[PDB]
From a paper:
The prenylated flavin ([name])-dependent ferulic acid decarboxylases (Fdc) catalyse reversible non-oxidative (de)carboxylation of a range of acrylic acids with extended conjugation. The final step in the pathway consists of the decarboxylation of 3-methylcrotonic acid, catalysed by an evolved ferulic acid decarboxylase (Fdc) enzyme. Herein, we report on discovery and optimization through directed evolution of Fdc decarboxylation activity with 3-methylcrotonic acid to produce isobutene. Recently, a reversible 1,3-dipolar cycloaddition mechanism was conclusively shown to underpin catalysis in [name] Fdc (AnFdc).
Numbering used by the authors:
A (entry chain A), B (entry chain A): 4 to 499, 503 to 504
């Protein structure tokens, strides 16, 4: 099976890329596996495959850390994300985000039901598993539980059957047969959970699939629109119908090659302690436990020699930056374009801890609008900050066509030099805020509202007659022949890709 | 003579450090020398010494580019600044800024007058030089003149003789015997020029010395207090009285080992076209010429085989970042401490294009103040933004003790995650603004007023009971033994200073 359609094949691809370290000696899931993974993420090293995890039993489980993190080289920096999507390993961020957006104007390709698959090779009924006896990692020393769920896909369906959502949301072990996790507005797992709670008749049929097709975990991390079934979006993106199999204990369908599947219910009534967790902005607040959603597990099925992927998330750079930030930025780019805003590109700079998105403006189109900064900022912020795709983003930075938004140093330069504090910004207090950012949920104001801003780093003539400066840099302050002469004589005079 | 006390010895030090490239073939001062230097600054390469400059005649002049720019290695990154100050080349930024501040609580050591020095080896009277016939560089293609003065020291004295100021301010060739340049408030050259204009009797006696003692050019770039003679501050910093010689045509005193000295007057009445220039924030605005101060040159004296230092300034990283930003930050740290504010460290992040200063707070002292963010922000901004040392800085970022302000990634992380836009900031519109920042002089509001902000990236408990988080990073989320085990087994398991 191709790497983008089968997690086991993806692990083989990373090996053949010389992008894997297999660790065949015993590793402790209590902090050690996550510490190694954390170090990998902070240094852009090879992904670790823990083949000998202390507490593994009867095939549950090996761990792959850092499945969507960065490579050290600039030329294949995003190669692990490219390997989720059948793209060359040298793919740019623009190419990855275009691939993720490509299905937005295609007919869905609905999934195909097959009678069996590798995920059925082994099973444990309700009398045969205990989630407290599996080698579930403790990821950060102060975590409030063992977070089994950092890179699996939750599967829930609307009561009327018309929408099946796939998404990533954290969850930890509560007891032998329950998890607790985050289920918060405006996320689709929360929107579906509210539909079942208003109906009021039963708990939500649920499955959680680990080690799913890589293209599916990408879509699971992306804010594609309300009501859109991720499986058909991934089908259209990849050009192929995904093969799914029915759960044993409910009527949901899981990817045939899933490494591990939990089947059960998400309660419409019960909660349990959840968190704290070391989160995407780089913090944990010890002891900060709150009631979260409660999941009951009725059955586990799994592949022979099953592999659990794990995100050891926190400070730069991991899946919570490469996938959450970039995929939200992609969706925001499309949302702006569909609202007739002249945005060509969007990216969440890693330097902002993916709390900003930089929006590259087609300034020829802006000039034809005959508008002003105050009006344009307000229009952009109203579109983005009133939409789910803007939920996690607190600062939008508007930049002109000379800035590559995929280059954080250039965004920082533009922000710092082109946006006058206060005057060139519009604050938004009456929008949904992202409580996970420390300055929101642990800050001075309302955890769930406000704290957002549009920062206009367009210069005044970009709205009127055009750019009126040249950069004071090698590229722009010297003619072409002279630049080429300098480059051609560089090593000769005495000075210093893959 | 020691490197910190003699520019010629400093050039020899860079050679012996393997930090110089000598370029003995002909190089054009029309853009080529500056293009090479620009490339050096953008890549942290070795400093270029142009020994064969097209248009040199009778010893005027060779050029040294990038005299205060960065080295490539992390371990001696600041080595060229250390070599200005007799510090080891591995000196930290904290150590360099402490050395620059050390004289602030010492008695001055006034200079010593000597009868001659190397700067008298050659002379040209008013009938013998023409500034348009020297190999003065064109530094950026769109510059409004040939900027002879990018790394020399202007020397002017108060009418009453009690204060002699040394400072760097740009100047370009106007005609055979005049320069034009920037002389703007609140700079000391401007404050002295205003004293002479109010007296109203004569033009300002002036000298401009190029290739001065490195320790002197550092002080020339620092906002030491009003009324303080830089020569006695440098004397105290270095522990030695500087040797100076009298000018031939006026009663000012110049460093004995200066490479090149211009003697003349700064007009109290005349102006001439000045600029545009590719400036420290990374921009040039073509055609943006304005009237500037006008200097008359009456005499040139120079060393045999004189060397002119040159800053090819613009985008990161050059002297306008390493010295302007860092030295202003140093002075702001001291100013805050003298106003009883609990600041331990200050630095202007390069990522902010040295428009921000991050202020590290001693949060134990903050807690004892029993204050709030709104009150503390206002107090800090009032102290800094009402003082000359805060002139060039538009955003102050307050951070707690866990942040190393000399590390831009950590400042960016703190800013992005701990400061709620709007609520955790105070805007300052009624303070002097720095018109050179594009969003000021080419922006939407008043060029000379406002546009400043204090951004509080202290978390709420830092004012009350103490830090309530741990970072989700390798350092803080794992115990010491486990970290050491991971590090000790790193290369063994298969993973990857001077
Ligand atoms: C890649 C990724 C995405 C996480 C995520 C993680 C990763 C690795 C974790 C598990 C390591 C840390 C926490 N995560 C959560 C999360 N969204 C959310 O609501 N709760 C979370 O707990 N997300 C983001 C979420 O997947 C995106 O917002 C999707 O757009 C949600 O899908 P939906 O649009 O269908 O609701
Ligand atoms: C290192 C350095 C400092 C420049 C500078 C440059 C460099 C290389 C240039 C020449 C390349 C670009 C422009 N410069 C100017 C400048 N200050 C100013 O008023 N006008 C300027 O034209 N400065 C800053 C100035 O030297 C500091 O603000 C000093 O504190 C001024 O001394 P003072 O406190 O005694 O007034
Ligand atoms: K999704
Ligand atoms: K602007
Ligand atoms: K000075
Ligand atoms: K704050
Ligand atoms: Mn969805
Ligand atoms: Mn001064």
């Amino acid at each position: 099976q191709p790497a983008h359609l089968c997690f086991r094949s993806f692990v083989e691809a990373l090996k053949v890329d010389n992008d894997l370290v297999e660790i065949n000696t015993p590793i402790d899931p209590n902090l050690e596996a996550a510490a190694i993974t954390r170090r990998v993420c902070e240094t852009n090293d090879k992904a670790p495959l823990f083949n000998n995890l202390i507490g593994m039993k009867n095939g549950l489980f090996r761990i792959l850390g850092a499945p969507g993190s960065l490579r050290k080289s600039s030329a294949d920096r995003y190669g692990r994300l490219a390997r989720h999507l059948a793209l060359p390993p040298t793919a740019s961020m623009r190419e990855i985000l275009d691939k993720m957006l490509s299905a937005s104007d295609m007919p869905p390709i609905p999934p195909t039901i097959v009678p069996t698959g590798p995920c059925k090779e082994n099973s444990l009924d309700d009398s045969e598993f205990d989630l407290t006896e599996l080698p579930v990692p403790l990821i950060h020393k102060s975590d409030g539980g063992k977070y089994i769920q950092t890179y699996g896909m939750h599967i829930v369906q609307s009561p009327d059957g018309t929408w099946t959502n796939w998404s990533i949301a954290r969850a930890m072990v509560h007891d032998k047969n329950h998890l607790t996790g985050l289920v918060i507005p405006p996320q689709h797992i929360w929107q579906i959970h509210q539909m079942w709670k208003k109906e009021g008749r039963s708990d939500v049929p649920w499955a959680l699939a680990f080690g799913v097709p890589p293209a599916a975990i990408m879509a699971s991390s992306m804010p594609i629109p309300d009501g859109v079934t991720e499986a058909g979006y991934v089908g259209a993106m990849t050009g192929s119908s995904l093969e799914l199999v029915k759960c044993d204990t409910n009527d949901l369908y899981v990817p045939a090659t899933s490494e591990i599947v939990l089947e059960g219910t998400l309660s419409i009534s019960e909660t349990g302690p959840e968190g704290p967790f070391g989160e995407m902005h780089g913090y944990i607040f010890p002891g900060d436990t709150h009631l979260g959603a409660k999941y009951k597990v009725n059955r586990i099925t799994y592949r022979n020699n099953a592999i659990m992927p794990m995100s050891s998330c926190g400070r730069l750079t991991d899946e919570t930056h490469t996938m959450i930030g970039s995929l939200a930025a992609a969706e925001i780019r499309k949302l702006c374009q569909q609202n007739d805003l002249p945005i060509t590109d969007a990216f969440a700079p890693f330097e902002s801890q993916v709390t900003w998105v930089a929006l590259r403006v087609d300034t020829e189109k802006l000039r034809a609008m005959k508008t002003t900064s105050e009006g344009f900022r307000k229009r952009v912020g109203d579109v983005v900050f009133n939409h789910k795709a803007g939920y996690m983003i607190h600062r939008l930075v508007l930049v002109g066509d000379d800035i590559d938004v995929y280059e954080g140093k250039d965004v920082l330069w533009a922000f710092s030099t082109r946006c006058r504090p206060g005057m060139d910004e519009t604050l938004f207090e009456d929008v949904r805020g992202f409580p996970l950012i420390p300055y929101m949920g642990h800050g001075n104001g309302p955890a769930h509202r406000g704290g957002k801003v549009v920062s206009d780093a367009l210069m005044p003539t970009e709205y009127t007659t055009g750019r009126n400066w040249e950069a004071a840099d090698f590229n722009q302050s010297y003619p072409e022949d002279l630049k080429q002469k300098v480059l051609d004589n560089w090593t000769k005079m005495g000075f210093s890709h893959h």
